[PDB]
């Protein structure tokens, strides 16, 4: 009982998969990925403030992601992405590793049909500013 075997496995698979996906991103998608990182970094502080305002379920964040994606803009999609990223930082061992992947599933499952062209044009505008 000296190590959280699940947490150690989650770290290995998470990094390998992170690099596996990044490997297969086109040049254009790599630009969008860096734009998303900046966009998510800008909204992070406002997001944590609203969440801390109402601070205390895995359904709650899933419900917020769903509301943010309710037929939506690039700004709300980015906010939903960063919310998942912040829940991921809190759900780092044991039974919390289940709620994170499901939360991401809600994100991707609830995306609008036009997500690709909407974010492509928006994140490019992010690249212009920064």
């Amino acid at each position: 009982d000296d190590i959280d075997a699940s947490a150690v496995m989650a770290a290995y698979l998470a990094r390998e998969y992170a690099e596996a996906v990044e490997e297969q991103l086109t040049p254009r998608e790599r630009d969008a990925l860096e734009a998303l990182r900046v966009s998510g970094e800008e909204v992070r502080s406002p997001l944590l403030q609203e969440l801390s305002n109402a601070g205390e379920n895995s359904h709650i964040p899933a419900a917020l992601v769903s509301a943010l994606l309710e037929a939506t803009s690039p700004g709300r999609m980015v906010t939903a992405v960063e919310l998942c990223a912040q829940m991921g930082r809190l759900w780092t061992r044991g039974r919390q590793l289940v709620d994170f992947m499901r939360l991401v599933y809600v994100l991707l499952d609830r995306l609008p049909p036009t997500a690709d062209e909407d974010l492509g044009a928006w994140l490019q505008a992010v690249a212009r500013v920064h």
Binding site: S39, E42, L47, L64, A67, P74
Partner: peptide, 23 residues
């Protein structure tokens, strides 16, 4: 849940500000 509703309304509002801050 009523609280969740108002919380998501605050996040949807943050999302809108992120859209407006681009134009």
């Amino acid at each position: 849940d009523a609280s969740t509703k108002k919380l998501s309304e605050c996040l949807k509002r943050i999302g809108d500000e992120l859209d407006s801050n681009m134009e």
